[PDB]
Every structure is written in structure tokens, then in C-alpha cells.
Amino acid sequence: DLKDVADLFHQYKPYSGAAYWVRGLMERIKDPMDRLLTSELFREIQRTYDHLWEEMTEYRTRAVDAWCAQVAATSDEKLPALVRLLRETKYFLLLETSSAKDLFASADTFRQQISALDLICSIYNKVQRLAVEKPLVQQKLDAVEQALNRGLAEIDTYIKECMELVKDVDLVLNTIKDNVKATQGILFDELNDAFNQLIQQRHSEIRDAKGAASWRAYVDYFSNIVIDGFSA
Amino acid sequence: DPNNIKRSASYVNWHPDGSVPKVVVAYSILQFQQQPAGMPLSSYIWDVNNPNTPEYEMVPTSQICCAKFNLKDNNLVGAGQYNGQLAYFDVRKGNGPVEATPIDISHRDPIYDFAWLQSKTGTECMTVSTDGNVLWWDLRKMNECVENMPLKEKNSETTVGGVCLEYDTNAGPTNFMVGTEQGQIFSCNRKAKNPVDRVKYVLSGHHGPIYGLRRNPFNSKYFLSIGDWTARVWVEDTAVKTPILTTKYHPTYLTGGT
Amino acid sequence: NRVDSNLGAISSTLLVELEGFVEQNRFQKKQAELLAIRNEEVRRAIEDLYTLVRNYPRENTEDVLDEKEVSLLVRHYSKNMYNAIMQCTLNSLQA
């Protein structure tokens, strides 16, 4: 079974699955040498044990050399890759208790993973943000805050830009208030029906405040929708 | 089907009533630098009465794994993902998340689980990750973490993984083991009669990344350890921290059975 | 199994069961999908069989290509055994 291990080893020869491959088989093979040695065949078993055990330690050594190089270089570019390298640092960190600036930066971009999960709220907000919204967007000055983000798009600057995002999320709440007013403008007894339509139009007009023209256009679309629905 | 392409099946669970031969299946790809630039995943339900085009297809918002079912019923199905985002689906809509378990602070890590507790007259769950923080969620009403304890080893290296946890075949008051991937099976009870620290067992002795864990059924409580390329049988006593019927040292690194 | 648990159950069906006979029409919808469903897997199964016979190292086959015309004969036997199915089902039905 030393040759089953040797066959499986050199045939199938995260990133740190390799060091687990090594040290799995290695402490695995460490137990048998302990078991035997509690002398004619023992010399040839000493031959195979020698270099095979010995070069596989050579592979684990050069592995940590190469991936110290790889963590170092990907860290430099950062100043995908992130998920790989944080998972890797956790995993040989787990191994090495069983650089310091790097782990500080890891804690920093994890506590900023809070606000990197705020970036995803901001980018959702960019996604659902409009023919109704043509009025407000033609009158809104959101491009100033967008230009502040764009100058930010190429330390505490990140934190203040997160509060800028919070103010922008308030403007997103303004965009969804536009959406809500659009949706409530979407939806004998003729006096009751006329009163209901007038109440919906009055609610839209009160909830409003080119703008006058767009308000007239939305009212005309409401009148057309009312003629379409009430002729049935 | 010829859409079941470029997508490893990384689970198969079986439908729990008697004479419904349906299988719920679960297809993924890990080592995600080769995350597939093609298909966002959607698992399936096949039947054996006809090899039907999947009865229902569940579309998640990320890479479904570990997708357990709902206990003893023809309605509902759970799932796992890669964010941490659990999921939940009913049978009368072939669609996305019925009740997507949201993001909150802690669990933002890949989940190999969606394991049920015997919370009677209702439904429940727990998870496990490569951070440790095994994090119970709610029942029926779903959106909150009930007993959200980030668990912690006695000597404070709390990044303690797990796979494939097993419960009690004697009525199930919350005694269980977690298949911790660094070569050391852990165990727990959740009712801390002691202080909150209640991880008794580290059964060190299995080898490398462990992939197996199951209690034995049909008479007793002896659990299994088929995880690495040795297939043991272990026992639960405080004096037997070592196998009983060790079986063969194999070739071809082992990965899973029951 | 995959090529003769189907084709000995496709030839085991009974289409018409026991005015109101429109229910028979509805009934004969259902089993139709049955045979269609089963047929697809056999058109799958024989197909997959060919891939199994093709993709395999066998170092003394990388100078001798597989032939063709008898694989078309295997395909042809699959066709004719479908036909034997359906004629058996129809004659049993009319009986």
C-alpha cells in the first residue's frame, strides 16, 4: 500500500487543496513508520520512504513559496481575486495555527464589506431607476452627487462616500415615491365614479409637489386610461 | 436531459413519502474560479414513472447545493446556495424563491446544508459553513435567526467547518454531530445546561478533509465516518475515541456514502 | 432494461378503456404522451449506447476507426422493434 499511495500520488499530481493533499498523505504516511520501528527488507523500505516522504515535503515548501508570491501580487493589484485570496488567507492561516498589514487590510475590507453590501444596494437603486419620471429627472439635480461619485469612481473618503450613498438612497426613496404616485394614478353611480377619479387625480396632483406640461401629460394619460376602462 | 450539462450533481435527495418515486436533485460547480460563464443554475425534480422532463424546476439566485426537502409531505422544498442565502419553494409554481431567507449580519458564507430540526407542527432549519457560525433560522414565519449562536471552539479558533450533520433516531432532543472538515468530527447539544460552551467532542483521528457522517439506523446509535479514503465505523462513548470496525485503506480518495 | 423494459411495456399498453365516449377521447390523450415519453428515452438510450462504444481508450483502436453501416443497422433494429411495439398494441386494441 506504499505503492498504492505512490501511484495515487504521482498520477493525480480553493488553491490550498494542494497543501491539504500533501499533509493529508504525509501525516498519513507518518503513522506507519512509527508503527514499524517500535534488517534486510527494511533497507529498501527505507529507500522509498526516504526520498518519497522527502520530496513531498519539497512540494509543500515550494507551494508556500509560490503562493506567498501570489497573495503578495494579488494584494498589490487590489490596493474572483478577492474571494480566492480571503478564503486562502483564512485557510493557510488555519493551517499555520495548527502579512500583518495584509491581515489589517483584510479586517478593513471585511468591515467595509458592510459598505460593500451597501454598494450593492446603491447598484440595485441604479437598476430600477421613467416616462413619468421624465418630469422629475428633467428637473432633478442628481448629477451633482453623481459627479461626486464619479470623481470617486476614478481612507475616510470611502466612509464619507458611504454617507453620500445614504443621501442618494434617500433620493432613491424619492424615485420610488415617483413610482408609487405613478401606480396610484394607474388605478346614479356615475357621480361616485367621477368622485373616485377626481380623488385619484387630486391625490396625484397633491403628491406631486416642463413640470406643468408633464403633469398635464400624465393627467391626459389618466383621462385616456379612464376612457379605455370606463367604456367597457 | 441535455441541459444537465457542464453542471456536477453535488447532491441527490429523495422525496419522503412512500410511493412517490420522485427525486429532487441538485447540480452545481465549486472551485469557482471556473464558475461557469454559462448557465446560472436551476435544479429539478424528476420522476421514475416516466423519465419526465423535470416536473418542476427551481431557479435560485445563485449556485444551488445541498438542497434538502421538507419532511414527509408532497408540498414544499428547501435549498442551499453559495452566499448563505437559504431558499424555500412550493410545488404549485415553477418559479424562484417563495420565501428567500434574507441577508443579515453573520452568515455570509457557502452553505453545505439545510437541515431540519423536529420542531413539531411547523418547519425549521440550521446551517454550517467555512466560518463556523452555525446559525438557526425561524419556523413557518421565516425571516429571523432564532438562536443565532456563532459557535466557538474551546480554545478560540472558531473557523470550524462542517458537512452532513446527523440527528437522533431516538425522538431527537437536539443531540447531533457536525462533520468538521479539518479532520476532527465535532458534536453538540444546543440546550446549554452548562454555560453556552457545549461542544464536547473533538474525535480527532479521522484523516484530512472529512466527507462522511451518519448515525446508524435500524437498531442502535453507532455513527459512521466514510469521509476520507478510509471507511471506518465509529462509536459514541467517552472511552472509545477511536474506531470499531475500521475497514480498508483504499485507493482513489473517498468522498461519500451512508 | 432501458431498451427492453420500455419496448415490452410500450407494447403492453391498452389505449381504449372501459356520447359519453368523449371521455375515451380524453383518455386517449393521456396515454399518447406516455408512448411519446417512453419513445424519447429509447431514442435517447440506443443513442447513448453508441457513445459508450465509441469513447474508451483501447490503444489498439487508434489506428482502426469504428465502421458505420452496421451502427446504422443497430439503429435500424431499434426502429423496427418500435414498429413491432405499435402493431402489437393496435392489434390487441382492435381485438
Swiss-Prot record, chain B:
Belongs to the dynein intermediate chain family. Signal peptide: none annotated. Consists of at least 3 heavy chains (alpha, beta and gamma), 2 intermediate chains and 8 light chains. The gene is ODA6. May play a role in regulating dynein heavy chain (DHC) activity. May function in holding IC78 to the DHC, or in stabilizing the entire dynein complex. WD repeats lie at residues 59-99, 106-147, 205-244. This is Dynein, 70 kDa intermediate chain, flagellar outer arm. It is found in: Cytoplasm, Cytoskeleton, Flagellum axoneme. Transmembrane segments: none annotated. The chain holds residues 156 to 413 of 567 of the full protein.
From Swiss-Prot, chain C:
Transmembrane segments: none annotated. It is found in: Cell projection, Cilium, Flagellum; Cytoplasm, Cytoskeleton, Flagellum axoneme. Residues 22-56 form a coiled coil. Consists of at least 3 heavy chains (alpha, beta and gamma), 2 intermediate chains and 8 light chains. Belongs to the dynein heavy chain family. Force generating protein of eukaryotic cilia and flagella. Produces force towards the minus ends of microtubules. Dynein has ATPase activity; the force-producing power stroke is thought to occur on release of ADP. Dynein heavy chains probably consist of an N-terminal stem (which binds cargo and interacts with other dynein components), and the head or motor domain. The motor contains six tandemly-linked AAA domains in the head, which form a ring. A stalk-like structure (formed by two of the coiled coil domains) protrudes between AAA 4 and AAA 5 and terminates in a microtubule-binding site. A seventh domain may also contribute to this ring; it is not clear whether the N-terminus or the C-terminus forms this extra domain. This is Dynein gamma chain, flagellar outer arm. It comes from Chlamydomonas reinhardtii. The chain holds residues 775 to 877 of 4485 of the full protein.
